[PDB]
Design a protein around this ligand. Structure first.
Ligand SMILES: CCCCCCCCCCCCCCCCCC(=O)OC[C@H](CO[C@@H]1O[C@H](CO[C@H]2O[C@H](CO)[C@H](O)[C@H](O)[C@H]2O)[C@H](O)[C@H](O)[C@H]1O)OC(=O)CCCCCCCCCCCCCCCCC
Ligand SMILES: CCCCCCCCCCCCCCCCCC(=O)OC[C@H](CO[C@@H]1O[C@H](CO[C@H]2O[C@H](CO)[C@H](O)[C@H](O)[C@H]2O)[C@H](O)[C@H](O)[C@H]1O)OC(=O)CCCCCCCCCCCCCCCCC
Ligand code: CLA
Ligand code: CLA
Ligand code: CLA
Ligand code: CLA
Ligand code: CLA
Ligand SMILES: CCCCCCCCCCCCCCCC(=O)OC[C@H](COP(=O)(O)OC[C@@H](O)CO)OC(=O)CCCCCCCCCCCCCCC
Ligand SMILES: CC1=C(/C=C/C(C)=C/C=C/C(C)=C/C=C/C=C(C)/C=C/C=C(C)/C=C/C2=C(C)CCCC2(C)C)C(C)(C)CCC1
Ligand SMILES: CC1=C(/C=C/C(C)=C/C=C/C(C)=C/C=C/C=C(C)/C=C/C=C(C)/C=C/C2=C(C)CCCC2(C)C)C(C)(C)CCC1
Ligand SMILES: CC1=C(/C=C/C(C)=C/C=C/C(C)=C/C=C/C=C(C)/C=C/C=C(C)/C=C/C2=C(C)CCCC2(C)C)C(C)(C)CCC1
Ligand code: OEX
Ligand SMILES: [Cl-]
Ligand SMILES: [Cl-]
Ligand SMILES: [Fe+3]
Lengths: 33, 33, 137, 448, 82, 340, 333
């Protein structure tokens, strides 16, 4: 179970970091005009 | 402009009894058992 | 059906003496009951002890008898168990413990008579609904 | 001031104030007066309807309990000893509203519509990132001082009401506030779920005061920071810099705080004393199981070995981690803590020996009281469950405070989504629709 | 849309002759309704029981209609025992 | 001819169109509305249900109603000149004559309105799909207010015209019919909720795919009824939902036909199920699970739980909800869980 | 410029299904909740929802059909406690206590919230107006109310709406007996929102279809009179307004398609917003109107109304719901 907890924690962190860094990557500029 | 029309009757058929009914219910608020 | 004087006529003591309350007196005893009793005694029951209710038949078998004005006023001053073996004013609202039950402070002698009366009058109107429970709702 | 020259209709007429710093200032000061007005008007209202011998939660009071929590006009057990501080709070807030309203109306219909060509200090442009952060810094320091006022009140000016005070609840002066970051910032890192409860689980005034000291310093320091600096590059590329955008940022914040205040007033009985606000949901349920445990034990029942219908203990059972807890449905509320129940708490939970011997009459009264004052009531204020008959006129202040602010919190989230999305679109240049001769999709390839 | 031909409601309710007429007619209908209840005429017209006309002094038994064709007399005999 | 002269007058372009259908619609509809307003203000239900149901008695807007006739009346028309009322207006109200009055005049009102829809559509020059769609409310009214009580013992078990009275009708159908377990109501739910979804998602999509046909921030002014161009981008709206939801509308005509289809079909389906309930032909149980549960006292689902709730509803509301049955339930026979 | 390539594909408008940064969270969570739901709905063992050692079967393999099948809420013993898999000694314990329920709804609520944000994102990428997500907030708030907000106020996820058809009905019936949701003005606005929504949906659908300009014959569908992306409107709003304006009166009809369509969005969304808040406010026990024994005659006898009849029905659900879970006379939790 400890192994599972660590695995999920790492998985979640990975995706959350994608969300934060992704929107921090000049999202307002990403528009047709 | 015409005074008494079909619309005139359509109004007063709802208008006249409504005010009469509103007055009735208004008097009911002072009824004590 | 109206609130006739015979309905408002409740026993005074335990030897047959009676008293006829007024309509306003009943409305006062109703208002005061909601003020300091209803929290535990809605409809004549007892939420914190459903084994005991405010039914006239129940009050009569209590010790001392509580099926009269003299009995109820005394209970509101010095409440006891159903057998009257011990005093319970320390856990039940009363004049004796109005310090820990602040709602009983401003209650006069007149206020106690009206409440006692309402407790006796109500089952004469609602019947078994008084002290019956959710079954008679 | 018309749609032909503004672009906005009458129902969006307040959107004409975006580029009018003068009128907009008057609108924010006038609305500010409305808030202080209600604060004073409602206070005097509650006082005029206030009955000293009755609990505050039986009279539908929400403002007086806030004042009473600050230790004003209350004594041992939370009993009212003086109604005058309540009166003062009402009058002063009411008097101040006239001042705010006066300037609010002035700046709105008489004052200059723009502050840019009047005073460069008060004049502001939304695009001006350096000006905005400066104003942000100012108000930050304002909030920091305000939190220190609570600290000053608790440590130097009478103190606060402590429901956890020894020998019963009372007004107590906080001498040793918790400054330990492992405790203060410990709350911020706690789980929001059961048994943890995030920052809502603060159960001592020492942590409350110490917390506001940190917030008091952090806001002042942060205020000084945003005044002496300008937004970094990554920040400038991550945000939308416009008036409506800043609004949506604050709307999201207030929405979040709204949900937080809801859970706080519903669960916490420390800064929301049950003496004033009435028992919480968990508290009332725990109090019921307590009441019939006491009653039945008096009758000769052995509450420890008493088996319920389902095999579980009728009065006492175990939590999933082993702690001895009340039986029945209230098993869910086993994380409840209260100054009337903790005396019966041991190292393994509820101690059976204390239960059999050390239950005091004031605990029996308190349990029965809270049991018969559960935060359950109808919209027309009828106490009890929905199947109850008309007799008791009661709805807990907790129910009023929790429901009202949840509604506001939700709509402000909607307000966040509305004003944020539009801010994005307006900054990009298509909030008023799609250009017919330059439709983006038409220039995009097919999906298949 | 155009307009059908009748006189616009806007100008009528803003006309003086209208409110000269309807400052009398509207309150009179209101008072008439008030008098219909305060006199107790409403009770006798529709047969709605007065607060003291639901039960007798010692009954809780509902005066419920049990017959179909003799239902009129069954209601009348209920009104009699009051 | 006099017929042609009258036809001209009836079909005159007025503020309120009349037509031939107006001769049936307007009086019936006025009596249905007026009859309800009259009953909920003055008329009681003390002799039919043993209930107060007017403002005159102390009821509020949520509790007032025009209640159904007593069960002893059966499926009587209860005409004012009928053998029950015998010309007496007062007795007529006390017996529940106003319920049939509203139900019947209201029925022919609905007929008049649907006819009005046909008539106007013929004069204007448009297809009668609005009248067709209105068949669903009618099918509902007929099945519930007419067919269902006709299938039962009397008008008594029809809905009473009132807010709380309808709520009674809802809970009755749960406790006795287990109406939630019926697939025909389920299809109705999907039609209503699905209709609300379509209504919300269409208006939102159109409003958020608008072309820029103005310089104002409020885009309502940027439209003209006589314009020939679309006001929103169907192309952009199609790509959006294609990437968000996976599928999307590509044909405007099929879209608005589908918006007719979903809620109309749903109501018709729920109407069919009510017809079944008129004969107590319910989807009350699953025999497979009753056999299992009766043999195995450890088998439990949310289905068996709801039936316990229905049993509670029935035993606890029946004596007062059906006072003509003279039900007397001693406390000891009432189905109760522990403590409560 | 390698991380930039990833960002471009994520925010790409040329994907068959838009991903987006909201989708980066949405896709895993929704897949997690969906996969667990399908497995639990079919093969999950009985669950002790009321926390009284009385397991309730919800899966197909344990004697349920589609109608009676459900994923059962977590145990009352758990309450609001966070209960992941790694907090259990074994999967057997986790399944017995209603583990799957929390896993699904939490991944779902997160996924659904990102779904709303994803709607804003694409609209921003396409140059649209962004308020379609605001309309989706109405059903999303409703889901939050029955899955998250109501369990919070009541103090247990066991009082959350079960993931099943019959379980849903159980949620509705118990709710009425305790909150009188029918006599609550917010559910009534919700009913007015969904009835009106269905009405207006049928209404708008019929009027546009009726005013369709003839482009086809009798031997083909009328839908082929419209081509995808055409400049001209397929119907005549002038004729449609002419009809509906005479059905009632012209000033009760819309001549503005933008104003009309806005109403189509506003009415059911606002309505569902209220019924969402209804559940959310009744979660803190601010219940529906109580008019029990409100009417009293001169003597004092209670003159029943339709409300008192509703009460009798509520009594029936109350005394029977969870027949073994109550040990004390007042139902608070
Ligand atoms: C940017 C944001 C991004 C967020 C991304 C996702 C991050 C995680 C989100 C978590 C959401 C909430 C989960 C927990 C819900 C809950 O059970 O929260 C409850 C907690 C309180 O928990 C309780 O806290 C209590 C503390 O009381 C204790 O301490 C007290 C001290 O006096 C007393 O002694 C008391 O007796 C004692 O029990 C107990 O511990 C209870 O067991 C415990 O349940 O509130 C709190 O944490 C504080 C309130 C938080 C907000 C509440 C949720 C709001 C959701 C709105 C959704 C709207 C969606 C709309 C869409 C359109
Ligand atoms: C059909 C109408 C359609 C109208 C459309 C327009 C929309 C607005 C409607 C406004 C309300 C209309 C009725 C106003 C009359 C009224 O309400 O009058 C009622 C009261 C005053 O009446 C008094 O109300 C009291 C209420 O009890 C309160 O006081 C009691 C006695 O002290 C007890 O202490 C009890 O615990 C406490 O709750 C008692 O019942 C008194 O006997 C009674 O005289 O007005 C008050 O209180 C003041 C209320 C101010 C606003 C309250 C804000 C809180 C909002 C919480 C939101 C949560 C979700 C709500 C969902 C709905
Ligand atoms: C801090 C709060 C705040 C502020 C400062 C603003 C400011 C603004 N909003 Mg925003 N908004 C907010 C919160 C806020 N909003 C919230 C919480 C929501 C979600 C409900 C919205 C939803 C919203 C929309 C949908 C729109 C705006 C728009 C606007 C602009 C015009 C506002 C206007 O003219 O209103 C005029 C005010 C009214 C017409 C009165 C409304 C009254 C409501 C409907 C009922 C109130 C009931 C009351 C509480 C109780 C009953 C009382 C009654 C019985 C007497 C302006 C930039 C507009 C915009 O985009 O402009 C660019 C626009 O279209 N807002
Ligand atoms: C919190 C509420 C609030 C506030 C503070 C404001 C404030 C403002 N609105 Mg807005 N507005 C609001 C709500 C509010 N609005 C709502 C709900 C709506 C929807 C109906 C609108 C619709 C709307 C429109 C359509 C417009 C404004 C505009 C304005 C601005 C100019 C108003 C003006 O010239 O009035 C002129 C009115 C008067 C001179 C009459 C008297 C007004 C005063 C303030 C009365 C004070 C009474 C008070 C008791 C006095 C106390 C005195 C003290 C000493 C005790 C002003 C900044 C205008 C704008 O943007 O202009 C650029 C504009 O066109 N508003
Ligand atoms: C949000 C608050 C606020 C802001 C930003 C402004 C800003 C402005 N006001 Mg306005 N004003 C306000 C509130 C505000 N006012 C209020 C509430 C009133 C009612 C008393 C007035 C009455 C008023 C008048 C009568 C006039 C202005 C004018 C001005 C301008 C010049 C001010 C100046 O030079 O001050 C310089 C600073 C001072 C004179 C000393 C200020 C000392 C302060 C008040 C001591 C207390 C500080 C303490 C922290 C306050 C706590 C408040 C509490 C609610 C938290 C400027 C555009 C003038 C203008 O526009 O002329 C064309 C003008 O004639 N204001
Ligand atoms: C009212 C409060 C407030 C506001 C509105 C702002 C606003 C701003 N600050 Mg300032 N700031 C404040 C208070 C505030 N600050 C205070 C009091 C301090 C002292 C500590 C600072 C210290 C500070 C610094 C040091 C910096 C800013 C900067 C900024 C800018 C960028 C902020 C940003 O990107 O946030 C977005 C936040 C993030 C991207 C953080 C990562 C995301 C986390 C994980 C969110 C977690 C949320 C979740 C719900 C959990 C919350 C609970 C708990 C676990 C934390 C912006 C102008 C930046 C700048 O450019 O200044 C010139 C900068 O570097 N601020
Ligand atoms: C469009 C008009 C219309 C329609 C369709 C209806 C329809 C109905 N009304 Mg309503 N009603 C109307 C207008 C209408 N009403 C108006 C304007 C009023 C106010 C004055 C009323 C007042 C009213 C009352 C008071 C009652 C009804 C009732 C009824 C129902 C029974 C009617 C009946 O048996 O008629 C029978 C009559 C006919 C079908 C007419 C037949 C005509 C043909 C040509 C035969 C001609 C015979 C010839 C002249 C010989 C005569 C006899 C001779 C040999 C002696 C029915 C649902 C009853 C009800 O609802 O009870 C619950 C009831 O009591 N109505
Ligand atoms: C101002 C009050 C706002 C109340 C909350 C918002 C309700 C209406 C919005 C619902 C969103 C639907 C999904 C998006 C639908 C959508 O995309 O709408 C699009 C529509 C188009 O507006 P524009 O884009 O032209 O203008 C938006 C801004 O730029 C201002 O011009 O927006 C509006 O009409 C806003 C109307 C504000 C006024 C609305 C008041 C309605 C509520 C009144 C009170 C009712 C109480 C009922 C109680 C029973
Ligand atoms: C802008 C605008 C607006 C708004 C405005 C406002 C909002 C204002 C406010 C204002 C205000 C906010 C005001 C206030 C005032 C207050 C006052 C004026 C107060 C006074 C007080 C007093 C007088 C007191 C007295 C007393 C004493 C001293 C003691 C106690 C008791 C008594 C009561 C005796 C509007 C929308 C309308 C429109 C236009 C625009
Ligand atoms: C006083 C007190 C206390 C304390 C408190 C504290 C200390 C607090 C703090 C607090 C804090 C310190 C908070 C913070 C927060 C944060 C936040 C809230 C954040 C947010 C963020 C955001 C919102 C972002 C967003 C985004 C993303 C996600 C990505 C990129 C883009 C953007 C930017 C949009 C205690 C409890 C002890 C006790 C009681 C009293
Ligand atoms: C039965 C009958 C009949 C009939 C009669 C009628 C037709 C009557 C009518 C009556 C009427 C026709 C009445 C009316 C009434 C009305 C009313 C009573 C109204 C009320 C209203 C209100 C109350 C309002 C409310 C509201 C709304 C809704 C809006 C929002 C807010 C408020 C709250 C303001 C005849 C003789 C032929 C024959 C024999 C039988
Ligand atoms: O768990 Mn599911 O439902 Ca809420 O209330 Mn108490 O807990 Mn039981 O009874 Mn009724
Ligand atoms: Cl229990
Ligand atoms: Cl159940
Ligand atoms: Fe459309």
């Amino acid at each position: 179970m400890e192994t599972l907890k660590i695995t999920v924690y790492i998985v979640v962190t990975f995706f959350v970091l994608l969300f934060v860094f992704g929107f921090l990557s000049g999202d307002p500029a990403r528009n047709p005009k | 402009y015409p005074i008494f029309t079909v619309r005139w009757v359509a109004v007063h058929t709802l208008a006249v009894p409504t005010i009469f009914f509103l007055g009735a219910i208004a008097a009911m608020q002072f009824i004590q058992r | 059906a109206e609130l006739t004087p015979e309905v408002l006529t409740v026993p005074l003591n335990s030897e047959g003496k009676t008293i006829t309350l007024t309509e306003k007196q009943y409305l006062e005893g109703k208002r005061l009951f909601q003020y300091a009793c209803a929290s535990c005694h809605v409809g004549g029951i007892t939420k914190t002890n459903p084994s005991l209710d405010l039914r006239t038949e129940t009050l009569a078998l209590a010790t001392p008898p509580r099926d009269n004005i003299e009995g109820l006023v005394d209970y509101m001053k010095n409440p006891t168990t159903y057998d009257g073996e011990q005093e319970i004013a320390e856990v039940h609202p009363s004049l004796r413990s109005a310090d820990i039950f602040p709602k009983m402070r401003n209650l006069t002698e007149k206020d106690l008579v009206a409440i006692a009366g309402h407790i006796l009058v109500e089952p004469k109107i609602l019947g078994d609904k008084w002290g019956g429970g959710k079954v008679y709702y | 001031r018309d749609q032909e020259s503004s672009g906005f209709a009458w129902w969006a007429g307040n959107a004409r104030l975006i580029n009018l710093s003068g009128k907009l200032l008057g609108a924010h000061v006038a609305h500010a007066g409305l808030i202080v007005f209600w604060a004073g008007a409602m206070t005097l209202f509650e006082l005029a309807h206030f009955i000293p011998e009755k609990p505050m939660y039986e009279q539908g009071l929400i403002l007086i309990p806030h004042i009473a929590t600050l230790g004003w006009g209350v004594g041992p057990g939370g009993e009212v000893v003086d109604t005058f501080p309540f009166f003062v709070v009402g009058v002063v807030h009411l008097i101040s509203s006239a001042v705010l309203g006066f300037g609010g109306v002035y700046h709105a219909i008489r004052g200059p519509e723009t502050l840019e060509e009047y005073s460069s200090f008060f004049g502001y442009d939304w695009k001006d990132k350096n000006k905005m952060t400066t104003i942000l810094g100012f108000h930050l320091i304002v909030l920091g001082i305000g939190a220190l006022l609570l600290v000053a009140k608790a440590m130097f000016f009478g103190g606060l009401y402590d429901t956890w005070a020894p020998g019963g609840g009372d007004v107590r002066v906080i001498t040793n506030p918790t400054l330990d970051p492992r405790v203060i910032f410990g709350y911020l890192l706690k789980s929001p779920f059961g048994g943890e409860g995030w920052i809502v689980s603060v159960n001592n005034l020492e942590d409350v005061v110490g917390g506001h000291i940190w917030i008091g310093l952090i806001c002042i320091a942060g205020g000084i920071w945003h005044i002496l600096t300008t937004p970094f590059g990554w920040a400038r590329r991550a945000f939308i810099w416009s008036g409506e955008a800043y609004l949506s940022y604050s709307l999201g914040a207030l929405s979040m705080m709204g949900f937080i205040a809801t859970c706080f007033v519903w669960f916490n009985n420390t800064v929301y004393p049950s003496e004033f606000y009435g028992p919480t949901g968990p508290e009332a349920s725990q109090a019921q199981a307590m009441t019939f445990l006491i009653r039945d034990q008096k009758l000769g029942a052995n509450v420890g070995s008493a088996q319920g219908p389902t095999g579980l203990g009728k009065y006492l059972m175990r939590s999933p981690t082993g702690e001895i807890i009340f039986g029945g449905e209230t098993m869910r509320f086993w994380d409840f803590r209260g100054p009337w129940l903790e005396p019966l708490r041991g190292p393994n939970g509820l101690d059976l020996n204390k239960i059999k011997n050390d239950i005091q009459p004031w605990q029996e009264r308190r349990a029965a009281e809270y049991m018969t004052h559960a935060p359950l009531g109808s919209l027309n204020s009828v106490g009890g469950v929905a199947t109850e008959i008309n007799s008791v006129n009661f709805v807990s202040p907790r129910s009023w405070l929790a429901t009202s602010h949840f509604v506001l919190a939700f709509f402000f989230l909607v307000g966040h989504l509305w004003h944020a999305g539009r801010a994005r679109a307006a900054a990009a240049g298509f909030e008023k629709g799609i250009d017919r001769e330059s439709e983006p999709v038409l220039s995009m390839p097919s999906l298949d | 849309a155009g307009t059908t031909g009748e006189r616009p409601f806007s100008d009528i309710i803003t006309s003086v002759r209208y409110w000269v007429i309807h400052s009398i007619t509207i309150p009179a209908l209101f008072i008439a309704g008030w008098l219909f209840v305060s006199t107790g005429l409403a009770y006798d017209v529709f047969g709605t029981p007065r607060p003291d006309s639901y039960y007798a002094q010692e009954q809780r038994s509902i005066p419920l209609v049990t017959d179909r064709f003799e239902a009129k007399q069954q209601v009348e005999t209920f009104l009699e025992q009051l | 001819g006099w017929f042609d002269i009258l036809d001209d007058w009836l079909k005159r372009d007025r503020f309120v169109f009349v037509g031939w259908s107006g001769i049936l619609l307007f009086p019936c509809a006025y009596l249905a509305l007026g009859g309800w307003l009259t009953g909920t203000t003055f008329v009681t239900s003390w002799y039919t249900h043993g209930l107060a149901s007017s403002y005159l008695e102390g009821c509020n807007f949520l509790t007032v109603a025009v209640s159904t006739p007593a069960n002893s009346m059966g499926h009587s028309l209860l005409l004012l000149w009928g053998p029950e009322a015998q010309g007496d207006f007062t007795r007529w109200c006390q017996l529940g004559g106003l319920w049939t009055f509203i139900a019947l005049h209201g029925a022919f009102g609905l007929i008049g309105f649907m006819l009005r829809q046909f008539e106007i559509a013929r004069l204007v020059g448009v297809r009668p799909y609005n009248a067709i769609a209105f068949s669903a409310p009618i099918a509902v009214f007929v099945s519930v207010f007419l067919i269902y009580p006709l299938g039962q013992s009397s008008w008594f078990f029809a809905p009473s015209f009132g807010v709380a009275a309808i709520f009674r009708f809802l809970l009755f159908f749960q406790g006795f019919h287990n109406w939630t377990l019926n697939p025909f109501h389920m299809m109705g739910v999907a039609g209503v909720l699905g209709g609300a979804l379509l209504c919300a998602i269409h208006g939102a999509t159109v409003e958020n795919t608008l072309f820029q046909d103005g310089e104002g921030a409020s885009t309502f002014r940027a439209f003209n009824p006589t314009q020939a161009e679309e006001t929103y981008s169907m192309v952009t709206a199609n790509r959006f939902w294609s990437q968000i939801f996976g599928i999307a509308f590509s044909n405007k005509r099929w879209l608005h036909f589908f918006m007719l289809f979903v809620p109309v079909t749903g109501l018709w389906m729920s109407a069919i199920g009510v017809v079944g309930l008129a004969l107590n032909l319910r989807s009350y149980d699953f025999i497979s699970q009753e056999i299992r549960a009766a043999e195995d006292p450890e088998f439990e689902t949310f289905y068996t739980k709801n039936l316990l709730l229905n049993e509670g509803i029935r035993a606890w509301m029946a004596p007062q909800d059906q006072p003509h049955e003279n039900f007397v339930f001693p406390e000891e026979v009432l189905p109760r869980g522990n403590a409560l | 410029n390698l991380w930039e390539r990833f960002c471009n594909w994520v925010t790409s408008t040329d994907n068959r299904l838009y991903v987006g940064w909201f989708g980066v969270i949405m896709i895993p969570t929704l897949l997690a909740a969906t996969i667990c739901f399908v497995i639990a709905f079919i093969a999950a063992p009985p669950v002790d929802i009321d926390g009284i050692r009385e397991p309730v079967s919800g899966s197909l393999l344990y004697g349920n059909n589609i109608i009676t099948g459900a994923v059962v809420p977590s145990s009352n013993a758990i309450g609001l406690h966070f209960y992941p898999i790694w907090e259990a000694a074994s999967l057997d314990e986790w399944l017995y206590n209603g583990g799957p329920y929390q896993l699904i709804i939490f991944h779902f609520l997160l996924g659904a919230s990102c779904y709303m944000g994803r709607q804003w994102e694409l609209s921003y990428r396409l140059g649209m107006r962004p308020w379609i997500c605001v309309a989706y907030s109405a059903p999303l708030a409703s889901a939050f109310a029955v899955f998250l907000i109501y369990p919070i106020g009541q103090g247990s996820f066991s009082d959350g709406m079960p993931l099943g058809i019959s379980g849903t009905f159980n949620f509705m019936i118990v709710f009425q007996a305790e909150h009188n949701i029918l006599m609550h003005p917010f559910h009534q606005l919700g009913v007015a929102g969904v009835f009106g929504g269905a009405l207006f949906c049928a209404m708008h659908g019929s009027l546009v279809t009726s005013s369709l300009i003839r482009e086809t014959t009798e031997t083909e569908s009328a839908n082929y009179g419209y081509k995808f992306g055409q400049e001209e409107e397929t119907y005549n709003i002038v004729a449609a307004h002419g009809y509906f304006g005479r059905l009632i009166f012209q000033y009760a009809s819309f001549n503005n398609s933008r104003s009309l369509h806005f109403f189509l969005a506003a009415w059911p969304v606002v309505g569902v917003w209220f019924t969402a808040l209804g559940i959310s406010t009744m979660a803190f026990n601010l219940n529906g109107f109580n008019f029990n024994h409100s009417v009293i005659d001169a003597k004092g006898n209670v003159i029943n109304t339709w409300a008192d009849i509703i009460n009798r029905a509520n009594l029936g659900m109350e005394v029977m719901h969870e027949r073994n879970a109550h040990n004390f006379p007042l139902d608070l939790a």
